[PDB]
Protein backbone atom coordinates (compact mmCIF):
# COMPACT_ATOMS: atom_id res chain seq x y z
CA UNK A 1 0.00 0.00 0.00
CA UNK A 2 2.26 2.80 1.35
CA UNK A 3 0.88 6.29 2.10
CA UNK A 4 -0.69 9.30 0.47
CA UNK A 5 -0.25 12.70 2.10
CA UNK A 6 -1.28 16.33 1.90
CA UNK A 7 1.20 18.44 3.85
CA UNK A 8 1.77 16.89 7.26
CA UNK A 9 -1.24 14.49 7.09
CA UNK A 10 -0.63 10.96 5.81
CA UNK A 11 -3.05 8.05 5.42
CA UNK A 12 -2.92 4.62 3.74
CA UNK A 13 -2.72 4.52 -0.03
CA UNK B 1 -4.27 -2.07 7.77
CA UNK B 2 -2.09 0.89 8.69
CA UNK B 3 -1.70 4.24 10.33
CA UNK B 4 -2.99 7.75 10.03
CA UNK B 5 -0.30 10.34 10.78
CA UNK B 6 0.10 14.09 11.35
CA UNK B 7 3.76 14.84 11.07
CA UNK B 8 5.61 12.52 13.43
CA UNK B 9 2.53 11.29 15.35
CA UNK B 10 0.88 8.10 14.07
CA UNK B 11 -2.19 6.17 15.28
CA UNK B 12 -4.17 3.18 13.86
CA UNK B 13 -6.15 4.09 10.75
CA UNK C 1 -4.17 -4.05 17.84
CA UNK C 2 -1.87 -1.32 16.68
CA UNK C 3 0.47 1.17 18.17
CA UNK C 4 0.41 4.85 18.93
CA UNK C 5 3.76 6.38 17.98
CA UNK C 6 5.72 9.60 17.98
CA UNK C 7 8.41 8.87 15.47
CA UNK C 8 9.56 5.37 16.31
CA UNK C 9 8.63 5.76 19.99
CA UNK C 10 5.60 3.49 20.14
CA UNK C 11 3.27 2.02 22.71
CA UNK C 12 0.23 -0.34 22.43
CA UNK C 13 -2.77 1.71 21.31
CA UNK D 1 10.20 2.94 -4.33
CA UNK D 2 9.38 6.10 -2.36
CA UNK D 3 7.15 9.05 -3.25
CA UNK D 4 6.28 11.45 -6.01
CA UNK D 5 5.08 14.88 -4.81
CA UNK D 6 3.72 18.01 -6.46
CA UNK D 7 3.11 20.95 -4.21
CA UNK D 8 1.68 19.67 -0.90
CA UNK D 9 0.57 16.31 -2.24
CA UNK D 10 2.62 13.07 -2.16
CA UNK D 11 1.71 9.49 -3.05
CA UNK D 12 3.64 6.28 -3.93
CA UNK D 13 5.81 6.43 -7.03
CA UNK E 1 20.17 10.93 13.81
CA UNK E 2 17.99 7.81 13.86
CA UNK E 3 16.59 6.01 16.90
CA UNK E 4 18.07 3.74 19.64
CA UNK E 5 15.96 0.70 20.61
CA UNK E 6 15.81 -1.90 23.41
CA UNK E 7 13.33 -4.49 22.14
CA UNK E 8 10.44 -2.57 20.54
CA UNK E 9 10.82 0.66 22.58
CA UNK E 10 12.89 3.33 20.89
CA UNK E 11 14.02 6.91 21.60
CA UNK E 12 15.79 9.48 19.35
CA UNK E 13 19.52 8.73 19.11
CA UNK F 1 22.86 -1.44 24.92
CA UNK F 2 20.62 -2.82 22.16
CA UNK F 3 20.31 -1.69 18.52
CA UNK F 4 20.32 1.58 16.57
CA UNK F 5 18.52 2.39 13.29
CA UNK F 6 18.32 4.89 10.50
CA UNK F 7 15.29 4.16 8.33
CA UNK F 8 14.84 0.39 7.81
CA UNK F 9 18.58 -0.27 8.43
CA UNK F 10 19.62 -1.05 12.00
CA UNK F 11 22.48 -2.65 13.98
CA UNK F 12 23.87 -3.06 17.57
CA UNK F 13 24.67 0.09 19.50
O1 LIG G 1 11.99 -0.86 11.42
C2 LIG G 1 12.87 -0.90 12.23
C3 LIG G 1 12.58 -1.74 13.48
C4 LIG G 1 11.80 -0.97 14.53
O5 LIG G 1 11.67 -1.69 15.73
C6 LIG G 1 11.01 -1.15 16.86
C7 LIG G 1 9.76 -0.26 16.66
O8 LIG G 1 8.54 -0.89 16.31
C9 LIG G 1 7.38 -0.11 16.57
C10 LIG G 1 6.20 -0.40 15.62
O11 LIG G 1 6.47 0.05 14.31
C12 LIG G 1 5.63 0.92 13.57
C13 LIG G 1 6.47 2.16 13.20
O14 LIG G 1 5.74 3.37 13.17
C15 LIG G 1 4.71 3.50 12.19
C16 LIG G 1 4.97 4.74 11.36
O17 LIG G 1 4.38 4.76 10.08
C18 LIG G 1 5.24 4.50 8.98
C19 LIG G 1 6.28 5.55 8.53
O20 LIG G 1 6.88 5.09 7.32
C21 LIG G 1 7.67 5.99 6.57
C22 LIG G 1 9.10 5.96 7.12
O23 LIG G 1 9.88 7.12 6.97
C24 LIG G 1 9.38 8.33 7.49
C25 LIG G 1 9.69 8.54 8.97
O26 LIG G 1 8.73 9.46 9.46
C27 LIG G 1 7.54 8.98 10.02
C28 LIG G 1 6.29 9.81 9.71
O29 LIG G 1 5.26 8.99 9.19
C30 LIG G 1 4.73 9.40 7.95
C31 LIG G 1 4.22 8.30 7.03
O32 LIG G 1 5.13 7.90 6.03
C33 LIG G 1 5.31 8.70 4.88
C34 LIG G 1 6.76 9.13 4.65
O35 LIG G 1 7.21 10.21 5.48
C36 LIG G 1 8.24 11.02 4.95
C37 LIG G 1 7.69 12.46 4.97
O38 LIG G 1 8.06 13.51 4.07
C39 LIG G 1 9.45 13.79 3.93
C40 LIG G 1 10.13 13.85 5.34
O41 LIG G 1 9.52 14.85 6.14
C42 LIG G 1 8.47 14.55 7.02
C43 LIG G 1 7.09 15.09 6.58
O44 LIG G 1 6.11 14.18 6.08
C45 LIG G 1 5.40 14.65 4.95
C46 LIG G 1 4.85 13.61 3.99
O47 LIG G 1 5.52 13.53 2.75
C48 LIG G 1 5.91 12.31 2.20
C49 LIG G 1 7.23 12.46 1.43
O50 LIG G 1 8.09 11.75 1.85
Q: Considering only residues 1 to 13 of chain A, which have any Cβ-Cβ distance to chain D shorter than 8 Å?
A: 2-7, 13
Instruction: State the DSSP code for D12.
Output: E
Task: Specify the experimental method.
Answer: X-ray
Nearest protein Cα to ligand 1, atom 4:
E8
Distance F1 CA to ligand 1 centre (A): 24
CA–CA gap between residue F13 and residue F2 (Å, rounded): 6
C-alpha separations of A10 from A4, B3, D6 in Å: 6, 8, 15
Q: What is the resolution of this structure in A?
A: 2.0
CA–CA gap between residue E2 and residue F4 (Å, rounded): 7
Beta-strand relationship, A9-12 and A3-6: antiparallel
Amino acid sequence: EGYKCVXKTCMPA
